[PDB]
Design a binder for this molecule. Structure first.
Ligand SMILES: CCCCCCCCCCCCCCCCCC(=O)OC[C@H](COP(=O)([O-])OCC(O)COP(=O)([O-])OC[C@@H](COC(=O)CCCCCCCCCCCCCCCCC)OC(=O)CCCCCCCCCCCCCCCCC)OC(=O)CCCCCCCCCCCCCCCCC
Ligand SMILES: CCCCCCCCCCCCCCCCCC(=O)OC[C@H](COP(=O)(O)OCCN)OC(=O)CCCCCCCCCCCCCCCCC
Ligand SMILES: CCCCCCCCCCCCCCCCCC(=O)OC[C@H](COP(=O)(O)OCCN)OC(=O)CCCCCCCCCCCCCCCCC
Ligand SMILES: CCCCCCCCCCCCCCCCCC(=O)OC[C@H](COP(=O)(O)OCCN)OC(=O)CCCCCCCCCCCCCCCCC
Ligand SMILES: CCCCCCCCCCCCCCCCCC(=O)OC[C@H](COP(=O)(O)OCCN)OC(=O)CCCCCCCCCCCCCCCCC
Ligand SMILES: CCCCCCCCCCCCCCCCCC(=O)OC[C@H](COP(=O)(O)OCCN)OC(=O)CCCCCCCCCCCCCCCCC
Ligand SMILES: CCCCCCCCCCCCCCCCCC(=O)OC[C@H](COP(=O)(O)OCCN)OC(=O)CCCCCCCCCCCCCCCCC
Ligand SMILES: CCCCCCCCCCCCO[C@@H]1O[C@H](CO)[C@@H](O[C@H]2O[C@H](CO)[C@@H](O)[C@H](O)[C@H]2O)[C@H](O)[C@H]1O
Ligand SMILES: CCCCCCCCCCCCO[C@@H]1O[C@H](CO)[C@@H](O[C@H]2O[C@H](CO)[C@@H](O)[C@H](O)[C@H]2O)[C@H](O)[C@H]1O
Ligand SMILES: CCCCCCCCCCCCO[C@@H]1O[C@H](CO)[C@@H](O[C@H]2O[C@H](CO)[C@@H](O)[C@H](O)[C@H]2O)[C@H](O)[C@H]1O
Ligand SMILES: CCCCCCCCCCCCO[C@@H]1O[C@H](CO)[C@@H](O[C@H]2O[C@H](CO)[C@@H](O)[C@H](O)[C@H]2O)[C@H](O)[C@H]1O
Ligand SMILES: CCCCCCCCCCCCO[C@@H]1O[C@H](CO)[C@@H](O[C@H]2O[C@H](CO)[C@@H](O)[C@H](O)[C@H]2O)[C@H](O)[C@H]1O
Ligand SMILES: Nc1nc2c(ncn2[C@@H]2O[C@H](COP(=O)(O)OP(=O)(O)OP(=O)(O)O)[C@@H](O)[C@H]2O)c(=O)[nH]1
Ligand SMILES: N=C(N)NC(=N)NCCc1ccc(I)c(Cl)c1
Ligand SMILES: [Mg+2]
Lengths: 320, 347, 174, 55, 51, 113, 52, 48, 98, 140
């Protein structure tokens, strides 16, 4: 039985599967702050599912055969191109930021669906709740217009209101000069072009907005660079959290059922990420969209609904 | 709302309507309307926002006022006949009050102001019930009292409804308000033919409900409530744009589609009674409905509007909405004309 | 004069309606509705409906007490309006009283009146039944039959009242 | 004079202009409960006083 | 069709939700004492009440 | 005739619609179109996918349609039966006229010049 | 009634209270019982157009 | 290609497939049997 | 008709005009709805009692039952209007003009 | 309206023109008052005076259209000595449409009104002559 009101009535209620270990943990920080490694260790020690940070091709990893699609099917938005030319005339900077917010929104729904349906917690690397720091940094450097910021806020207001914040927010506080050294040692040519003012804006937004906001509704663990190295000590911190605040205490089977019906319906999750607001950065002409849409349907296993593609070995189609 | 509570409330909406349709006693008819009104308000408030609160408040005030007028008519009828049987009324003042009360419940002009606002303020699923199922009870009552209805009053309400419904839809960009003004116009055709052949009223009602359900279901499938959000449908589900086009053409009454059948039969019954001016006026005025149906087809199916980059992320997921009965409804909405003589089943 | 008791009560009945229809503060509108409920009970009692008259008074007294509580919470202002404090309220009040006074004055002058529709004015007693001597209250017998004849009425009213509780809980749970 | 002006003006352009004006009159409302119900009272009154729909 | 009477109209919210008013449901302020049986005659307990 | 009855018993004195009725075939074709639209909106191979589902669309349309046509035919029989019985009962309202030939009836000639 | 399920099913949901000359508790007659009985029997079966 | 997630409709729902074909066969048999009844009854009432 | 009916029919009309001519408080208008039900109860009760329509004696009781359901429903919506805006004024309920 | 309408059609064409203008002016004034009542109720005037100004402006405009029509159509019938001709209502109808353009200050509304008021009035006389029914009584 696919989840629905009938499954709820017969007994599929969230409070049955949810224990004291059913938590949503988000790991945040600046670029090259060690989030990824810390997030992977926390997930493994606490026995939760790990979600690698949602990038450009996150959605491809969840549909089809899970492999990245050509870049025309992500809008041609490029993170490398954002570093080379943050002020591109083709609106790549915001188009990339709008694409990334939608990818995070989708990942958050997937994380919530996993948590509500199995009771196993999850670990994320940044989320819809902290994605705005990049937008604020982009705007203060002049990489995007105030209108792009307005569009981002319109989409956020009508999307982030539907979900619950993470139980635990883990922040790794690495100062900007150290990050600049870390980015420098990493080696990839494009990321070396990040300016310190850009990284300071990410930090200023993280501490000036995200953390004060999250504190009122989540458990926040703020670690320095050295404390963060030993994931065992972070796990010990999480294990003795009281969990005395936030909107999760007010949740009941009735409310989590309504939430589950949303996060399992991805087209409903993404509904407002394509609101008809015509910014040049994100507006696609009808001739371009038509061509790309045709090519997408000609990919292996994408013409039909999953399980009805004979080109990739689906059988019993005449009975399915 | 708990899923079991939602089902019980929906069954109470239907039970109230069914009570009206099986009752031989005016008191039970009035009870049925009250029970129906009681159970629909929580469906309007189900999303709990200031617009739904305003919508439900405006609906309750209008429906509760109409029920008072209805009960007044029943009591006057009791004084002048000493009985409660659901049938022709025995006092012309009782007939005026009951007719005005039923017109209020139907949202016919000039009692129409609530329909565009209430429909806009509630979800698509709730608007579907409001504009289809909720017409059954008031119509079933008119079907029984029409011998005592004042001919000038009912035809005045019908004409004003066709004009105001047609004119009102011209200025709308919101889909729910477009459906609301369409409903006002279609109500006019239903009650225009009522004094002449009530069977044609039922055919128009049945065909209208099918087409209206088809449109609301297609809007729900894509979660579209504005003209512009519906203009992205070509870049997601091309098949749906074609079904929308066919239904909209059908609702406009164009041959050889089903929606032409009620207009065809209503003109026939009116001309048989030497009513020539009125059916000609109604058909020409209905061209306003076709105009703003056609605008939707232009922005939905017959052109390709600009899209957004984030839409590409939608290509990778299938439609998950139930879309119950939609394949059957759209076929019935468009392909029924060769079976028109089947209307005798409604006699 | 006592023979016109039903007419006199009906005049006060209308006066109470003008009281709350002119819409002063709902505190005073509630008072107008309570007066009309009492005299309305008096009117129905004088036609042989003791149970109906007392029941409608009992029901509206409970209703207006709940309205009083909601008024102090949700429908109050710094200066609640009496009938004399607002020009619109006063105009409606006087207009209603004058219309009532004129209908009464003329119907009692001609022992009849024509206010849209023809009303006799001989005293409401003329239409009463002349010959009864049963050992029971006919109104009581009709009301009691709710439980033997009105099974269907019991079901739909019982269900409606249960759904009412369910519905108000939904409506008021934001 | 004829094809691009007067034959347009006297039929399609005039007819469509009237429909637009009528639409704005119908739909330009304040959304105020007080005004809509005040219009109900007027309709009931003229329905009786002028048209005798109650007779 | 724009008109002077509709010039101030805006398209409704995308998700039908209007922002909540910052209207203040102000609390009732009560002087509980000093002259009060429970204030021991000299306590001016200024209380903000909701109901 | 019978109150709230779909097919009154008197309707069995009429022949049933043939299963090869052209109207029934059209109704079945509508069921087929419904099946194809069902596949199309769910992005399944339109012709091939779910033949059992397509079969039930055709069968259910034909099943309901057979009873509608049976009731449609019955109601037109009742209309004819009522109309002729009324003509028998009121001969004076439906007199049989004396028919005149065109050699006797004067019709004006309107030249097309 | 629009749908006469009462007649088909043979269940009396509300037509016991439609007329004042139907059976009453303890056979209490209405004041106009005879007049209602006379009018009801005159008009029975012939339809409103003739009965009017 | 090979899906990263097992499709909901990856394999037939045989409980459904059986019910769907069973209903079609039942309705067709009912319809044919009903039609034969009507033809036989119609001739009997009409002395044919 | 008898003179009582003049005043009861007058009372219903007064309450009906009261309902159709809103002021500001939504509670003032909900009171007019309860008044309309009161006049119907009295007018129904008089006709039924006068004619000795024995079984109809329960009809006014049933009318009050659904009068209360209407009143309870009206107050529930008033609570939600009050919470949203801080007053039960009807001029605040104008969002759905656009 | 039923009584004021009968008065007009009960006094023959060209006979008692002054009486005719009374009836049509009475109809036009009633129509203007109805328009004012709905207008004032649905678009509240800024002040009581402004509501009275709007009413008197609509009611006079509507009465003027009714007056010019009922007079001109009667004068045409009298002068032409043809009381049964629809053309008289066309001339009367167009004149009313012209007055509407005058009270509105807009030759375009004057021209369009003259055409459609004139044709509508002409259609009314034809229907009266031939017995056309607008709200036809049910017969079959
Ligand atoms: C049987 C007999 C009938 C039974 C009833 C008998 C009487 C008993 C009382 C009945 C209840 C009355 C309820 C009155 C009420 O609550 O309305 C309050 C209503 C709104 O109350 P408010 O919030 O205090 O506003 C005050 C100012 O009006 C605010 O003014 P403003 O700021 O908006 O300024 C602009 C103003 C300017 O006003 C105008 O434009 C007037 C133009 C009139 C054209 C001349 O706009 C208007 O007033 C337009 C509305 C005028 C009424 C509609 C006329 C069309 O105010 C009024 O309209 C006053 C009317 C009071 C007298 C009522 C007379 C009742 C007779 C009805 C017809 C009888 C039919 C039978
Ligand atoms: C039988 C007697 C009764 C007679 C009444 C009339 C009968 C017909 C009733 C019609 C009812 C609606 C059913 C029509 C089925 C439409 C089939 C169709 O649209 O083709 C499918 C295709 C969907 O595209 P897709 O799923 O993505 O496949 C890849 C191609 N892009 O579609 C598309 O890709 C189209 C996308 C571009 C939009 C083109 C729009 C112009 C073509 C419209 C043709 C259909 C018009 C139907 C209206 C009635 C016509 C008389
Ligand atoms: C403008 C549209 C909005 C307004 C509605 C239009 C209605 C006003 C037009 C009036 C046309 C004249 C008319 O209505 O004739 C009525 C006449 C009634 O006569 P009847 O009683 O049925 O037969 C016995 C005669 N004693 O009818 C008859 O006798 C039979 C006449 C056949 C039906 C004619 C249908 C009316 C045609 C009017 C439009 C014709 C012009 C078309 C314009 C096309 C524009 C491109
Ligand atoms: C003949 C016409 C038949 C019309 C069939 C109507 C099918 C409508 C189905 C639409 C798609 C499925 C759907 O979900 O409908 C919406 C509504 C359920 O509400 P939903 O928002 O989906 O979720 C509720 C959880 N709170 O679903 C509903 O509640 C059903 C509302 C429609 C009921 C009235 C339908 C018209 C009258 C039917 C009688 C025919 C005469
Ligand atoms: C003997 C039959 C004669 C035909 C009579 C047609 C009468 C109108 C019937 C309307 C219903 C049409 C069926 C519903 C549409 C389903 C087809 C579709 O939506 O897409 C086309 C689809 C192929 O595309 P695909 O989605 O990739 O599926 C692969 C399957 N091989 O599927 C296909 O491969 C082809 C399926 C047929 C395509 C139908 C195209 C729509 C035609 C609409 C025009 C209006 C009909 C003509 C008007 C006069 C009506 C007689
Ligand atoms: C007026 C003249 C013209 C005549 C018009 C007549 C209109 C009324 C006729 C009925 C129209 C509806 C016919 C629907 C046919 C498609 C049903 C189907 O294929 O379902 C397949 C499967 C469910 O089948 P299942 O319910 O398990 O069968 C056992 C039943 N006890 O599961 C599925 O995957 C189906 C999903 C698609 C269905 C759309 C949603 C509707 C749900 C239908 C549920 C089953 C309907 C069974 C139909 C039997 C009716 C006799
Ligand atoms: C049943 C019998 C009823 C017969 C009359 C029914 C008419 C009801 C009309 C109500 C719905 C239409 C509302 C409407 O049209 O808008 C209000 C309109 C305002 O228009 P107004 O302000 O006068 O024009 C401004 C020019 N600068 O106000 C008006 O002027 C409309 C007047 C229509 C009168 C007819
Ligand atoms: C706070 C506001 C209160 C408002 C109350 C409104 C009351 C309404 C007015 C009721 C007055 C009715 O007035 C009533 O009329 C009848 C007229 O025959 C009188 O009845 C009369 O009967 C015969 C007539 O030949 C006379 O001999 C006798 O003197 C006289 O009583 C009553 O004596 C009188 O009381
Ligand atoms: C003669 C017998 C039958 C005649 C029936 C004619 C009815 C009208 C049919 C056409 C309806 C078109 O309705 C509308 O018309 C106007 C012009 O006319 C078009 O509008 C176009 O011209 C107008 C004015 O000339 C411009 O202000 C506008 O910028 C331009 O887009 C609209 O794009 C079209 O939507
Ligand atoms: C004999 C009967 C004929 C029946 C014909 C059927 C009538 C169909 C009526 C369609 C009405 C809508 O048509 C409407 O016309 C006006 C023409 O001013 C167009 O409006 C256009 O011109 C006006 C001014 O010229 C501009 O203010 C406007 O910006 C422009 O869009 C509208 O875009 C169109 O929506
Ligand atoms: C046989 C009887 C014939 C009866 C004829 C009846 C004719 C119909 C009259 C309807 C009422 C008048 O209708 C109304 O006229 C006035 C003209 O002042 C118009 O009003 C408009 O024009 C002028 C100046 O512009 C002003 O009134 C006002 O500023 C403006 O809104 C309204 O837009 C219109 O709604
Ligand atoms: C923009 C266009 C809008 C639609 C326009 C529709 C035009 C319709 C024209 C009116 C139809 C006929 O209108 C009506 O006909 C009937 C006859 O049957 C006349 O009926 C009259 O006949 C007799 C004598 O003949 C009179 O003494 C009597 O007063 C009246 O009954 C009406 O006086 C006339 O008003
Ligand atoms: N414009 C933009 N770039 C982003 C966003 N999230 C990540 N990035 C970029 O993606 C790259 C990887 O980000 P990081 O995870 O923080 O860097 P890292 O090397 O992986 O170091 P770790 O924190 O340990 O994971 C960086 O270049 C970021 O600038 C975003 O929301 N907007
Ligand atoms: N015109 C009406 N209001 N009544 C009506 N339908 N008269 C026509 C009579 C009729 C028509 C079809 C059938 I089948 C049957 Cl049995 C009887
Ligand atoms: Mg990383």
């Amino acid at each position: 039985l696919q989840y629905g009101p009938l499954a709820y009535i017969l007994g599929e209620k969230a409070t049955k599967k949810m224990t004291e270990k059913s938590k949503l943990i988000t790991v945040d920080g600046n670029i090259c702050s060690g989030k990824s490694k810390l997030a992977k260790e926390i997930a493994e020690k606490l026995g939760l599912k790990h979600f690698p940070e949602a990038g450009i091709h996150y959605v491809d990893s969840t549909t089809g055969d899970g492999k990245p699609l050509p870049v025309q099917f992500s809008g041609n938005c490029s993170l490398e191109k954002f570093y080379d030319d943050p002020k591109s005339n083709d609106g790549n900077s915001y188009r990339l930021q709008a694409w990334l917010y939608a990818s995070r929104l989708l990942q958050y729904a997937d994380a919530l669906e996993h948590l509500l349906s199995t009771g196993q917690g999850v670990v994320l690397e940044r989320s819809i709740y902290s994605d705005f720091v990049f937008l604020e940094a982009m705007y203060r450097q002049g990489f995007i217009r105030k209108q792009c910021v307005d569009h981002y806020n319109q989409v956020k207001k009508v999307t982030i209101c539907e979900y619950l914040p993470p139980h635990v927010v883990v922040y790794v506080d690495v100062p900007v000069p150290e990050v600049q050294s870390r980015i420098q040692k990493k080696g990839n040519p494009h990321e070396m072009k990040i300016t310190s003012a850009y990284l300071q804006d990410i930090e200023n937004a993280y501490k000036g907005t995200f953390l004060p906001e999250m504190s009122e509704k989540c458990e926040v663990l703020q670690y320095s660079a050295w404390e963060a190295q030993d994931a065992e000590k972070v796990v010990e911190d999480i294990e003795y959290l009281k969990y005395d605040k936030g909107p999760w205490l007010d949740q009941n089977d009735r409310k989590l059922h309504k939430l589950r019906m949303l996060v399992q319906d991805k087209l409903e999750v993404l509904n407002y990420t394509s609101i008809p607001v015509f910014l040049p950065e994100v507006t696609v002409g009808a001739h371009q969209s038509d061509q790309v849409f045709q090519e997408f349907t000609e990919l292996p296993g994408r013409k039909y609904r999953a399980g009805y593609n004979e080109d990739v070995g689906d059988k019993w189609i005449w009975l399915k | 709302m708990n899923p079991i509570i939602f089902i019980i409330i929906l069954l109470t909406i239907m039970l109230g309507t069914i009570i009206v349709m099986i009752s031989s006693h005016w008191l039970l008819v009035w009870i049925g309307f009250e029970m129906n009104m009681l159970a629909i308000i929580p469906i309007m408030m189900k999303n709990h926002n200031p617009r739904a609160t305003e919508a439900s408040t405006k609906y309750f005030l209008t429906q509760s006022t109409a029920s008072m007028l209805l009960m007044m008519a029943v009591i006057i009828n009791l004084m002048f006949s000493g009985q409660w049987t659901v049938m022709k009324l025995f006092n012309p003042m009782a007939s005026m009050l009951m007719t005005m009360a039923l017109a209020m419940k139907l949202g016919m002009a000039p009692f129409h102001f609530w329909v565009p606002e209430v429909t806009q303020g509630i979800p698509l699923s709730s608007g579907l019930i409001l504009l289809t199922w909720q017409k059954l009870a008031p119509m079933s009552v008119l079907y029984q009292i029409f011998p005592s209805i004042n001919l000038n009053l009912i035809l005045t309400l019908s004409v004003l409804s066709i004009l105001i419904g047609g004119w009102g839809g011209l200025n709308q960009t919101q889909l729910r308000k477009i459906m609301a003004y369409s409903s006002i116009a279609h109500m006019g055709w239903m009650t225009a033919v009522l004094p002449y052949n009530p069977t044609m009223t039922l055919l128009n009602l049945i065909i209208y409900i099918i087409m209206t359900s088809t449109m609301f279901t297609m809007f729900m499938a894509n979660s579209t409530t504005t003209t512009l959000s519906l203009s992205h449908t070509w870049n997601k589900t091309p098949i749906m744009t074609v079904l929308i086009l066919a239904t909209l053409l059908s609702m406009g009454g164009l041959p050889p589609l089903s929606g032409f059948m009620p207009k065809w039969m209503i003109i026939q019954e009116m001309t048989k009674n030497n009513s020539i001016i009125l059916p000609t006026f109604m058909a020409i005025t209905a061209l306003l409905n076709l105009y703003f149906y056609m605008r939707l087809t232009y922005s939905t199916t017959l052109t390709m509007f600009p899209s957004t980059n984030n839409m590409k992320m939608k290509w990778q997921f299938p439609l998950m909405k139930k879309m119950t009965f939609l394949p059957t409804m759209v076929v019935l909405s468009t392909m029924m004309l060769p079976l028109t003589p089947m209307l005798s089943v409604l006699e | 004069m006592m023979l016109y008791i039903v007419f006199i009560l009906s005049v006060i009945f209308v006066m109470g309606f003008v009281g709350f229809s002119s819409k002063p503060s709902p505190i005073y509108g509630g008072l107008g509705l309570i007066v009309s409920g009492g005299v309305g009970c008096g009117i129905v009692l004088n036609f042989g409906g003791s149970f109906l008259g007392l029941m409608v008074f009992l029901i509206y007294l409970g209703g207006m007490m709940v309205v009083f509580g909601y008024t102090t919470a949700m429908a109050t202002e710094q200066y609640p309006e009496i009938w004399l404090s607002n020009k619109a309220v006063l105009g409606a009040f006087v207009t209603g009283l004058l219309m009532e006074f004129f209908m009464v004055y003329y119907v009692l002058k001609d022992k009849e009146v024509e206010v849209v529709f023809e009303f006799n004015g001989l005293g409401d007693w003329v239409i009463y039944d002349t010959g009864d001597s049963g050992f029971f209250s006919e109104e009581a017998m009709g009301i009691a039959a709710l439980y033997s004849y009105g099974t269907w009425l019991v079901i739909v009213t019982g269900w409606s009242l249960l759904i009412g509780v369910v519905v108000i809980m939904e409506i008021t749970r934001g | 004079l004829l094809d691009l002006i007067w034959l347009e003006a006297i039929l399609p352009k005039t007819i469509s202009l009237a429909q637009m004006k009528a639409s704005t009159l119908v739909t330009n409302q304040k959304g105020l409960i007080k005004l809509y119900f005040l219009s109900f009272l007027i309709t009931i009154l003229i329905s009786m006083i002028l048209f005798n729909f109650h007779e | 069709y724009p008109t002077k009477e509709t010039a101030h109209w805006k398209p409704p919210p995308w998700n039908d939700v209007d922002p909540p008013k910052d209207t203040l449901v102000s609390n009732l302020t009560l002087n509980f004492g000093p002259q009060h049986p429970a204030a021991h005659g000299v306590l001016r307990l200024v209380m903000e009440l909701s109901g | 005739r019978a109150t709230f009855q779909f097919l009154p018993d008197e309707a069995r004195s009429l022949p049933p619609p043939k299963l090869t009725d052209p109207r029934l075939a059209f109704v079945g074709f509508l069921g087929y179109c419904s099946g194809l639209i069902d596949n199309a909106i769910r992005r399944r191979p339109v012709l091939l996918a779910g033949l059992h589902r397509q079969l039930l669309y055709i069968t259910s349309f034909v099943f309901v349609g057979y009873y509608l046509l049976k009731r449609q035919d019955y109601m037109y029989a009742v209309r004819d039966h009522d109309m002729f019985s009324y003509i028998k009962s009121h001969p004076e309202d439906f007199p049989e006229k004396d028919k005149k030939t065109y050699g006797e009836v004067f019709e004006e000639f309107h030249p097309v010049r | 009634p629009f749908f006469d399920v009462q007649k088909r099913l043979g269940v009396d949901l509300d037509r016991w209270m439609t007329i004042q000359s139907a059976e009453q508790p303890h056979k209490i007659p209405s004041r106009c019982h005879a007049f209602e009985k006379e009018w009801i029997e005159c008009a029975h079966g012939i339809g409103s157009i003739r009965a009017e | 290609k090979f899906y990263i997630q097992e499709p909901p409709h990856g394999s037939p729902n045989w409980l459904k497939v059986g019910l769907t074909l069973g209903t079609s066969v039942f309705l067709w048999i009912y319809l044919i049997k009903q039609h034969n009844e009507d033809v036989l009854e119609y001739k009997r009432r009409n002395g044919l | 008709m008898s003179m009582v009916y003049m005043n009861i029919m007058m009372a219903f009309t007064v309450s009906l005009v009261g309902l159709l001519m809103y002021r500001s408080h939504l509670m003032s208008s909900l009171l007019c709805l309860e008044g309309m039900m009161l006049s119907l109860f009295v007018m129904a009760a008089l006709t039924i009692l006068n004619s000795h329509f024995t079984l109809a004696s329960m009809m006014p009781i049933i009318l009050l039952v659904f009068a209360a359901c209407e009143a309870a429903l009206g107050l529930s919506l008033l609570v939600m209007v009050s919470n949203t805006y801080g007053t039960d004024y009807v001029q605040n309920l104008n969002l759905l003009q656009c | 309206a039923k009584t004021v309408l009968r008065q007009y059609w009960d006094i023959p064409e060209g006979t008692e023109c002054h009486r005719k203008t009374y009836a049509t002016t009475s109809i036009g004034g009633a129509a203007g008052l109805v328009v004012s009542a709905y207008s004032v109720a649905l678009k509240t005037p800024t002040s009581f005076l402004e509501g009275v100004a709007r009413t008197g402006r609509y009611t006079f405009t509507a009465a003027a259209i009714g007056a010019i029509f009922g007079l001109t159509s009667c004068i045409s019938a009298q002068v032409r000595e043809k009381p049964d001709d629809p053309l008289n209502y066309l001339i009367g109808g167009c004149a009313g449409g012209l007055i509407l353009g005058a009270r509105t200050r807009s030759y375009g509304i004057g021209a369009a009104a003259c055409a459609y008021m004139g044709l509508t009035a002409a259609l009314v006389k034809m229907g009266q002559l031939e017995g056309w029914q607008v709200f036809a009584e049910p017969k079959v």
